[PDB]
Amino acid sequence: GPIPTAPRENSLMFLSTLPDDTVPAYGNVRTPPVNYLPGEITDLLQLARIPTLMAFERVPEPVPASDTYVPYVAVPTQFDDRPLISFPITLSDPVYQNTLVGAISSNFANYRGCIQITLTFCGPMMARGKFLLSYSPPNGTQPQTLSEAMQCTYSIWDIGLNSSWTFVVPYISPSDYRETRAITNSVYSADGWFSLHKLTKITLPPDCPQSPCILFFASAGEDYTLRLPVDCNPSYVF
Amino acid sequence: GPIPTAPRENSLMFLSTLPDDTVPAYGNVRTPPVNYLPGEITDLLQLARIPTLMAFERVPEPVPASDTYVPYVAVPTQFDDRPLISFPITLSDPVYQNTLVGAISSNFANYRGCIQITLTFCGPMMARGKFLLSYSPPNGTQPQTLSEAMQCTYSIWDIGLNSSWTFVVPYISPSDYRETRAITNSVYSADGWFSLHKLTKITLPPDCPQSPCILFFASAGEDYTLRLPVDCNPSYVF
Amino acid sequence: GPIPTAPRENSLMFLSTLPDDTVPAYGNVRTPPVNYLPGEITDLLQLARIPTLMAFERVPEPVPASDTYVPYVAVPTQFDDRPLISFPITLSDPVYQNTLVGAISSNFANYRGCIQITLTFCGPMMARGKFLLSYSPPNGTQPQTLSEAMQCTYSIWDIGLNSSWTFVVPYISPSDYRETRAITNSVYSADGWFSLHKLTKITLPPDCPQSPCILFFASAGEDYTLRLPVDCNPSYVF
Amino acid sequence: DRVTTQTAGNTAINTQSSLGVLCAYVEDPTKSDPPSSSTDQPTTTFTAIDRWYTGRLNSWTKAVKTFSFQAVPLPGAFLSRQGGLNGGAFTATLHRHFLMKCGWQVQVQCNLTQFHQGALLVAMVPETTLDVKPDGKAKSLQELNEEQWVEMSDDYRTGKNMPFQSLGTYYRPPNWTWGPNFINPYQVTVFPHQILNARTSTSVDINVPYIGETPTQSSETQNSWTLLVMVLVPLDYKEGATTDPEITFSVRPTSPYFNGLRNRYTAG
Amino acid sequence: STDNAETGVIEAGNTDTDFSGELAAPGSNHTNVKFLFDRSRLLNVIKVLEKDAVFPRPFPTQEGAQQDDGYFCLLTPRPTVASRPATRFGLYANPSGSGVLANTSLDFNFYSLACFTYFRSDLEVTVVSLEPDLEFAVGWFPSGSEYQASSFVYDQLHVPFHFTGRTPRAFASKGGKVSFVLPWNSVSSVLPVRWGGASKLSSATRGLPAHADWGTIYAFVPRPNEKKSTAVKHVAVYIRYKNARAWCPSMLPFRSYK
Amino acid sequence: RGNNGNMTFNYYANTYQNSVDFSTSGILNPLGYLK
Amino acid sequence: RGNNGNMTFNYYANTYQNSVDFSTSGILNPLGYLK
Amino acid sequence: RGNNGNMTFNYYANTYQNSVDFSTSGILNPLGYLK
Numbered sequence A, B, C: 001g002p003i004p005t006a007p008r009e010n011s012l013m014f015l016s017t018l019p020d021d022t023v024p025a026y027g028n029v030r031t032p033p034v035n036y037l038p039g040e041i042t043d044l045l046q047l048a049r050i051p052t053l054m055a056f057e058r059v060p061e062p063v064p065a066s067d068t069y070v071p072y073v074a075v076p077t078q079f080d081d082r083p084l085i086s087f088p089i090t091l092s093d094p095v096y097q098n099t100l101v102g103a104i105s106s107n108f109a110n111y112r113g114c115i116q117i118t119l120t121f122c123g124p125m126m127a128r129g130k131f132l133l134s135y136s137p138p139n140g141t142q143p144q145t146l147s148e149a150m151q152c153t154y155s156i157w158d159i160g161l162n163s164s165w166t167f168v169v170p171y172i173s174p175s176d177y178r179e180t181r182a183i184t185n186s187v188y189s190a191d192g193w194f195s196l197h198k199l200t201k202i203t204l205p206p207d208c209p210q211s212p213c214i215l216f217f218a219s220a221g222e223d224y225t226l227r228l229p230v231d232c233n234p235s236y237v238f
Numbered sequence D: 001d002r003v004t005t006q007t008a009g010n011t012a013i014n015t016q017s018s019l020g021v022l023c024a025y026v027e028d029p030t031k032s033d034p035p036s037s038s039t040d041q042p043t044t045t046f047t048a049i050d051r052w053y054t055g056r057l058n059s060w061t062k063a064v065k066t067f068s069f070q071a072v073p074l075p076g077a078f079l080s081r082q083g084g085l086n087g088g089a090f091t092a093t094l095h096r097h098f099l100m101k102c103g104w105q106v107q108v109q110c111n112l113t114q115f116h117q118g119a120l121l122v123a124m125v126p127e128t129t130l131d132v133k134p135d136g137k138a139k140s141l142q143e144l145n146e147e148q149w150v151e152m153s154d155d156y157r158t159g160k161n162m163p164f165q166s167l168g169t170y171y172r173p174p175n176w177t178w179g180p181n182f183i184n185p186y187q188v189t190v191f192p193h194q195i196l197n198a199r200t201s202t203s204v205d206i207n208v209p210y211i212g213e214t215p216t217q218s219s220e221t222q223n224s225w226t227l228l229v230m231v232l233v234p235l236d237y238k239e240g241a242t243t244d245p246e247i248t249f250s251v252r253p254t255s256p257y258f259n260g261l262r263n264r265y266t267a268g
Numbered sequence E: 001s002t003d004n005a006e007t008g009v010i011e012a013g014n015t016d017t018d019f020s021g022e023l024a025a026p027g028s029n030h031t032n033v034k035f036l037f038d039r040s041r042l043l044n045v046i047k048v049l050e051k052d053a054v055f056p057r058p059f060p061t062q063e064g065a066q067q068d069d070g071y072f073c074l075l076t077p078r079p080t081v082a083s084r085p086a087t088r089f090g091l092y093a094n095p096s097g098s099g100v101l102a103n104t105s106l107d108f109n110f111y112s113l114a115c116f117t118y119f120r121s122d123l124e125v126t127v128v129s130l131e132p133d134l135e136f137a138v139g140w141f142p143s144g145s146e147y148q149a150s151s152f153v154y155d156q157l158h159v160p161f162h163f164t165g166r167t168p169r170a171f172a173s174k175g176g177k178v179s180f181v182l183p184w185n186s187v188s189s190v191l192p193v194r195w196g197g198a199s200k201l202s203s204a205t206r207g208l209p210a211h212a213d214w215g216t217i218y219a220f221v222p223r224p225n226e227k228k229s230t231a232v233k234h235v236a237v238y239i240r241y242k243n244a245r246a247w248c249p250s251m252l253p254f255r256s257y258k
Numbered sequence F, G, H: 001r002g003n004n005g006n007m008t009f010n011y012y013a014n015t016y017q018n019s020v021d022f023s024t025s026g027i028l029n030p031l032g033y034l035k
């Protein structure tokens, strides 16, 4: 006979994220095989690990072409005891906006793990020089001086045969996960700053272009993870 | 006691194609046996494989009987370097309209596999001659010349003791399935053309009728398959 | 937790013939035993097999008592080459109306198997005579002549020591089941006719009553079956 | 090979251009059992009815158009003697039984020449009413002779002209537009058939088993099989060649079962 | 390749028969008969009874007859007219005139793919309301049976006998639907898609089968005759073929070139 | 059995779903015998 | 099978859910044979 | 798996609940290889 049941208060509810299936309406359909297709992606982290270019406003001297954002930093010849460039370790910051790590990460609420900054020297091969890359966890005031940067996490990069240098921003946080978007500024959504200082000015022989450029890439480190899918920002269509 | 349940959002829905049964209202009924009945059909492909006649508009010279469509092609005596007849390999084309393959196929969205064209010479036995049947996959322009047809898939048929010739249109497609109906013309719903050229004019002895006719049949090849049942076109009743 | 369910389109429906139980409202009730009661009936066919009297309009010469229908046929003395009595093998015919076979059968849509007609001679024991009972499957015209009846299924019954004769109407049909009610006359609801002819006139000694009577009974044969319960005709109460 | 002689009773039909016998649905359409719907011992085959009966059809001429046809109802043709098809003892037995179940072996004969051209489609078609006029009456022998061949038309292609019951004055007469007994001329090759092509043979053979909506059927009204002869390619030849080739056919009832013996059928 | 179609048998070939290639692997089995017909489609739209009815009389029906038209639905893919079996299928191009417009039905989909002579299956019936918030019930009687007319009086209210009986009666909830499956119940073994016989020996219509159906359904309001309304209500009848089987290859309807 | 197609399960015990007699502790037979 | 994806359970017995013939006690075959 | 927490039962057969390719018969790998 009939099985007695007691439907719950949420009967007939439509839950967009319900972890279950619904009834098939047109089954017994066989599809063309996809074994011939290479390049299958299993997890978006596979793409977040691919380094992509960052973006910086071209030093107050833009090109007649509107929206003058560049993927590199030109190394000025004049000495100055402050960073050549610096940006916060806040994933929602515009410098990461168009990198895959940043774009993908903006679609989740949290991240855990290391971010990786990769630099590629694009000046002439005859050039020589050294740079000091540093990462400073939050402080009341952002460090500017070489003396200050040198007291944080840093590495000195030497220009030579090999063109690039990878710099892993350690995951130093009070919480096991951090906010992907700095809706409100806090120690959970803003984790300090990365900065690049020229250690010893670039040296060039005669008849060599000046101001060599350094390309910047960002990507997820090997232990980088994203959690909690969130609603997307549809503005890219406006 | 009562089992707690959570009816889903689509409760009470009536799905015309639901892959399941409904409650019996008048059961325990035994029916007269049907073992005595021969000719049982298990799959409609069994019928699509039976060749049936195609239809062509009788060369601009109809009979006083309206709707002058014929199942054959009369072989004219005058030389002309273009096809005696040709039609697209588009299952919704009128030439297949009343063949079983075409009629059955029009009730599904896709097909995969070979189509078979069968020709039967119905001229006198004293007649001799040769024909060139060809299939051309899509091209910007439909081939017309013997020289062009000869560069596609083709076979030369010799008239003699045996009256017929089967021609299998290979399944040459970018996709594993093709559209059964050319709602929009594309490489997925139109697959080129089949054409018949007279290779060497028909030769007859004196006192023999002229213009022998060739009957055309169409059917599903052995690897022919149909997928996705679609709504029928009820116009046959209007 | 709650089991997800998907109630169907026919939820809450009340089906008068649903092959299932409903909830008990006053259980744990023990009833007085019925072992003491003999005569239990398991199937109504057990009753349909019991022969009961048929009914005929008394030959255009009724008794002052309205509704003059009789369970017998008086054997007239005058010779006449046509049936003494005849009726169709159509279960809804009035001659079966009040027999158990007919009454029970009228409550189902179909029957399969043999019907049995039993005759009992009720004339004096000194009487002698012979009768020819015949069954004719459908024909354009109903047979009347002894010569015609004799070409169908028939048996010759001799009057003597034993008083009765059973006649089984064979089940001769195009379909495995036949209609119980001749709503529309067809080969599926009307199966010919049964008729009784006097073969050799009845012979009696002097001082013997004339016109002996023959009682008619109808019942289900051993292979008789009924299928599909239908709505009853409540008119017996009006 | 191409030369065969088929014997049945005191009958034998020969052909020297056989294409083989087309057997419908099963390898041996002759195997058949008694009907489960009749409890009386049936009358089965006896030598006087185990044979070929031969009759005539109207001649084929240059004027007959594509898709024009002739139909032979079975066992109807035996009952009306269409084409002179007198079924001897078979008809006599048929007329005396309410029910009859059987299959058929048929051969259509039509010789042409190596100088003629044209083709006839010969098929055994299940459940048709091609032998009836739209008014519901069966075509008489005279009507068949007057028309010779029935022309394919919108009515036949549509089933629009099949027999029907007039509704009565109570109803607005509707526009009849279609019928399930239509004929799609292009698909007649779906049925058990052979093609009689002037250039390949002078005969065709088809062998079909019993079929029906029920185990057995009314002798007087059944028409489960109909022999159909339809023009696919018009006849043609030069002056001097024999004109109007004739067409004949032979029919043999197979594994018959008769039930419900009674006096001869008499129309009501 | 060389052949002789006159034989009545032509083998299905493939690319490698005369050319060079291989067989294409099978993509589906959707042409399978059982799978193909196992889906619901619209059969007819009928009016809802609000009192005991008078079943339409047999043809030919003469003017002046008193009966209920457009209420009974014969369960069959075959053409029907005024709740009865038919041969020709008709409609009304000119709905203007005098006389009752006979209801007609046809399973359009079924016949577009019915390339066979006989068919058989069980039948799943679904009745959907075409009216807002309608409370109705469905009645059904077997092939070869008939509608039980008249009514009985309870508390001076007339209750049609179609409220009772031994056959299925399905009362839907307000705004609900009705659904159930019926077995092949005709006395015939199979249903003739096309037929060449006659159901009677005299004055019969050739080609008109007598019981090629799964019975008849009708809909009614669970209310006594007295509480009758004036606005006619309609209900849609859907059918689905279960465990379908087919026999003897045949043709598909002719498609006009005009 | 009766008009019941439920082969599977019986939620309520036999003594609740049905009534049963208290204790005092195919082949259709004829209803009449000639002796 | 037909258009049925229910592999699991059948609540109603086969003789109720379906009709069955009473007793009287892949590979697609051709519908025609040339002999 | 996907966003599915149903470990228990699957009422509809795999070929109905999902589509499957017809036959023609943790560890995240790189999408690029330097050779």
Ligand SMILES: [Ca+2]
Pocket (backbone or CB within 6 Å): A005, A007, B005, B007, C005, C007
């Ligand atoms: Ca529930």
